[PDB]
Design a binder for this molecule. Structure first.
Ligand SMILES: C[C@@H](CN1CCC(Cc2ccccc2)CC1)[C@@H](O)c1ccc(O)cc1
Lengths: 459, 386, 48, 48
């Protein structure tokens, strides 16, 4: 059967070079044959959205609605959930306002997005803050529907690891009233942590960064970190955003729009074909708009069980029980000087790779730069070097993550392996006590060849 | 010519719309109008949500309204709640309720610009607190279902009891739709506390009355404190004679809520149009992506409203946007009939000349609620100790 | 013997029971399905 | 920390509040004149 799959595109982008997809015809090995029907939309009003959904539904019997826009409004996304209340259609989020998560949703709704929830993204941010040794941090949350599980997830996550974390105070800001009574500045002036996690929307981040830009909030010592729902589109960059904003996303640069739409069609068609291939009994198609009291009994939640463990092309392209992807292939981007989102990290389900960017995090902005390299040798009593545990991978408390540059002597060919360990001892204690007093950044590493200095021939 | 200002409202039958249009005409007469002219515009509850949203974007939003009212869908069952309707104004930043008894609207995240003038089931719990001061109670048991109303009533009851006074013992939860609930009566009976406070719907309260009735738990010492969903409908013949109940004053036909509603909104318009700026709502929902700049300010004007000489009594809003000084009536089932035994004006509880009858055949409430013996002492396994 | 002394100095009845395993407050630290939790020990006095 | 305030320019660049917001002492000494003390108390009355 030929099932209709409509792709709603909202924005000024020309859809001529977008709707032209050659991944059909020959890619119809399944007994069910889908067909793509892409539509365009200029305005971003709910009346036009519901109008095109009802008229497009009654005109063409569609099954999988793939909504994709490019704005930065989450409320419209909630309206999409309302559409589920009248349709129960597995709506997938690819990019735009529909790319923002929404914790605590309806148990009967079918709102699924490619972006992970706050549990995975929060773990990624805590891993980035854990590798760069960022213990003292701050948390800034607003009235976004889904902050209880965020703060309880951060607290419940830091209370488990043996690393000596430090939590200052989780404050809250109001956006319904402008900063006219001198309160937001009084709540933000108590934040003296080098890393601050922001949890809000874009229109709120413009005002928070607008006040913080006036009240000394941006330079060094006040690094803001936002997830994926704050930045949203990588093509809309205002001006009030300061330099140095750690952001996360999914593929984006790797898989473009036709790739995400093709993957969505593969997930909807595959999940719609597993029930026909296993249960051998599928109901009818979707009804019209207001005719819900008759087709409300034909809906089956068993397809939900097919929307958790989905495989495609070997890769683990599945989801979870909350309606989000379980193991995403996230990409970490960082803002530079010319205001352009450039990739700096590659997070694969678990492991994190930092190849496009070097070990140093900052560059040059007003304030001082560089650091100070410190090298020592494993001298008992003074310098005790201990290997890192495989069940953690990060040193704890005063144990300084001292790297080690070795070269694998493979017969007649050398390489370049970097094994990181944890150094601790008297020298670490005194250098950390005076380092905390004088307040500067440094580094620590060992020697792999040459040992103590001596005389060779005449040098 | 005065400025034509429209007011949105969501009513049910045509008579309520006639009372609304008459209340607007009286609002344009009793109030001094020198530059504004109120307009009456109300719709009906549609059986479908899409047709209702189109009726708002083509009846209410197309007329450029400032304040929007809401009441209750005239349906005997509950399947399509009007809560998503409240999200419509959420896209354009104020909706006032009339008979919305669900406490879900009390939240500020999903319901930002939304205020109601009706006490929900949570406010009744406050009256229950007064009961804890009427006969000096301490140990209470809250039996609620597993949904949002039970968690809201649990956080509300826990918020009210935050000082060094009484506290809550063991809160029991159950899934709405399970009849076999004997374990709740066994574990509730094993506990020393006897004050039972039930707050559920009809089918659940019926199962509590049947399961609690087939185990002989309606004698002396057992107290049943319910609200309004346990002594109305099919759950009335199964309730014991003497159960403490409640009854909201003027439940059906609330013309005073419409008249006082147009009075408060009219006062907020005549008073709001005396400061500066005051933007105008967009025309319809066709190409209107910008929000309303006068949202939290309009909610602030609607919240700061005082009417000590009103029809309902004393109109006053709290910090959350509810109805202060609720007017209820403590009822009691006597001889298969609901006999009025008390009234609640808002500050204290006033008793009439009828004596409260207990389901266990008692007439006077003893001092001690429950006392006995049998103490349970447990210990660990230690060789030199035990 | 202390429980017998406290049982004879006050007019009341008791019932001693042995407790099994679980003598550390039950620290919720093991990852058990990515969900919330609730305090059910620590103090160890309110089971039922 | 003995801070210093400038009365030549009004508090329009958000500096006097930033200099007075770091005073968490139970007693503060004021060494200036009257027309300056009225402005210092005027801004401090709004800040807190
Ligand atoms: C305003 C809300 C989203 N808002 C719009 C959609 C509404 C749900 C709805 C569903 C179906 C039809 C109409 C409406 C739910 C509430 C959100 O942006 C937000 C909350 C808190 C916050 O600090 C920042 C942003």
């Amino acid at each position: 059967p030929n099932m209709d799959i409509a792709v709603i595109l909202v924005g000024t982008t020309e859809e001529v070079a977008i709707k032209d997809v050659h991944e059909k015809d020959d890619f119809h090995h399944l007994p069910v044959t889908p067909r793509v029907e892409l539509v365009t939309m200029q305005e971003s009003d709910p009346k036009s959205i519901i109008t095109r959904i009802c008229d497009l539904m009654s005109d063409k019997k569609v099954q999988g609605v793939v909504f994709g826009d490019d704005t930065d409004q989450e409320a419209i996304a909630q309206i999409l959930d309302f559409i589920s209340v009248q349709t129960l259609t597995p709506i997938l989020g690819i990019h735009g306002g529909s790319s923002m998560i929404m914790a605590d949703k309806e148990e009967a709704s079918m709102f699924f997005q490619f972006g992970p929830s706050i549990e995975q993204q929060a773990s990624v941010m805590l891993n980035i803050m854990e590798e760069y040794d960022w213990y003292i941090f701050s948390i800034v949350t607003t009235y976004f529907p889904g902050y209880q599980d965020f703060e309880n997830k951060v607290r419940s996550t830091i209370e488990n690891s043996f690393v000596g974390w430090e939590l200052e105070e989780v404050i809250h800001l109001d956006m319904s009233l402008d900063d006219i009574d001198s309160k937001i500045q009084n709540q933000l002036k108590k934040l003296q942590s080098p890393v601050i996690l922001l949890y809000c929307t874009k229109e709120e981040a413009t005002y928070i960064f607008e006040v913080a830009h006036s009240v000394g909030l941006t330079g060094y010592g006040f690094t803001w970190i936002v997830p994926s729902l704050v930045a949203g589109d990588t093509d809309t960059v205002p001006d009030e955003f300061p330099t140095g904003l750690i952001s996360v996303s999914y593929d984006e640069w790797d898989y473009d729009l036709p790739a995400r739409v093709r993957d969505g069609i593969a997930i909807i068609t595959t999940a719609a074909s597993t029930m026909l291939s296993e249960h051998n009994s599928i109901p009818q198609s979707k009804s019209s708009c207001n005719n819900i009291q008759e087709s409300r009994v034909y809906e089956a939640h068993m397809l939900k069980r097919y929307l958790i463990n989905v495989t495609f092309e070997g890769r683990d392209l599945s989801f979870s029980e909350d309606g989000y992807q379980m193991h995403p292939k996230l990409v970490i981007i960082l803002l530079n000087q010319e205001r352009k989102w450039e990739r700096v990290g590659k997070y694969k389900d678990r492991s994190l790779k930092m190849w496009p960017v070097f070990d140093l995090y900052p560059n040059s902005e007003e304030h001082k730069d560089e650091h100070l390299s410190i090298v020592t040798l494993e001298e008992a009593p003074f310098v005790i070097v201990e290997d890192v545990d495989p069940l953690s991978g990060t040193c704890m408390r005063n144990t300084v993550p001292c790297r080690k540059q070795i070269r694998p002597e493979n017969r007649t060919e050398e390489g370049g392996n970097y094994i990181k360990r944890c150094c601790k001892g008297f020298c670490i204690d005194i250098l950390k006590k005076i380092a905390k007093t004088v307040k500067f950044t440094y580094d620590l590493y060992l020697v792999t060849n040459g040992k103590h200095g001596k005389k060779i021939n005449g040098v | 010519d005065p400025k034509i200002v429209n007011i949105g409202a969501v009513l049910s039958t045509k008579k309520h719309e006639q009372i609304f249009r008459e209340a607007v005409n009286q609002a344009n007469f009793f109030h001094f109008t020198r530059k504004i002219q109120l307009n009456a515009t109300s719709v009906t509850h549609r059986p479908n949500a899409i047709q209702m949203a189109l009726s708002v974007c083509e009846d209410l939003i197309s007329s450029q309204v400032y304040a929007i009212l809401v009441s209750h869908p005239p349906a005997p069952t509950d399947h399509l709640t009007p809560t998503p309707i409240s999200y419509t104004a959420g896209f354009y930043r104020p909706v006032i309720g009339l008979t919305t008894r669900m406490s879900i609207y009390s939240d500020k995240s999903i319901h930002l610009s939304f205020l109601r003038t009706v006490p929900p089931y949570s406010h009744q719990a406050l009256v229950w607190f007064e009961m804890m001061r009427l006969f000096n109670w301490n140990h209470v048991i809250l039996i609620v279902s597993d949904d949002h109303e039970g968690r809201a009533a649990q956080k509300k009851l826990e918020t009210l009891l935050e000082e060094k006074e009484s506290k809550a013992d063991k809160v029991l939860q159950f899934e709405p739709g399970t009849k076999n609930l004997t374990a709740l009566l066994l574990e509730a009976k094993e506990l020393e506390a006897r004050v039972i406070i039930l707050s559920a719907s009809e089918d659940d309260a019926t199962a509590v009355y049947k399961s609690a009735a087939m185990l002989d738990m309606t004698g002396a010492g057992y107290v049943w404190l319910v609200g309004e969903r346990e002594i109305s409908g099919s759950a009335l013949r199964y309730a014991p004679d003497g159960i403490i109940g409640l009854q909201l004053i003027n439940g059906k036909n609330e013309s005073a809520h419409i008249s006082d509603a147009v009075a408060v909104v009219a006062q907020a318009i005549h008073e709001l149009f005396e400061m500066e700026q005051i933007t105008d709502p967009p025309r319809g929902c066709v190409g209107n992506t910008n929000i309303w700049k006068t949202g939290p300010l309009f909610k602030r004007v609607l919240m700061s409203s005082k009417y000590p000489d009103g029809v309902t009594g004393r109109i006053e809003f709290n910090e959350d946007g509810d109805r202060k000084f609720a007017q209820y009536s403590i009822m009691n089932l006597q001889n298969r009939k609901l006999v009025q035994v008390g009234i609640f004006d808002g500050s204290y509880i006033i008793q009439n000349d009828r004596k409260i009858i207990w389901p266990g055949g008692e007439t006077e409430r003893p001092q001690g609620y429950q006392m006995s013996t049998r103490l349970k002492i447990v210990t660990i396994h230690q060789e030199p100790f035990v | 013997d202390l429980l017998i002394k406290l049982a004879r100095e006050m007019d009341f009845t008791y019932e001693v029971h042995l407790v099994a395993d679980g003598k550390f407050g039950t620290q919720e630290r093991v990852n058990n399905s990515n969900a919330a939790a609730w305090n059910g020990m620590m103090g160890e006095l309110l089971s039922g």
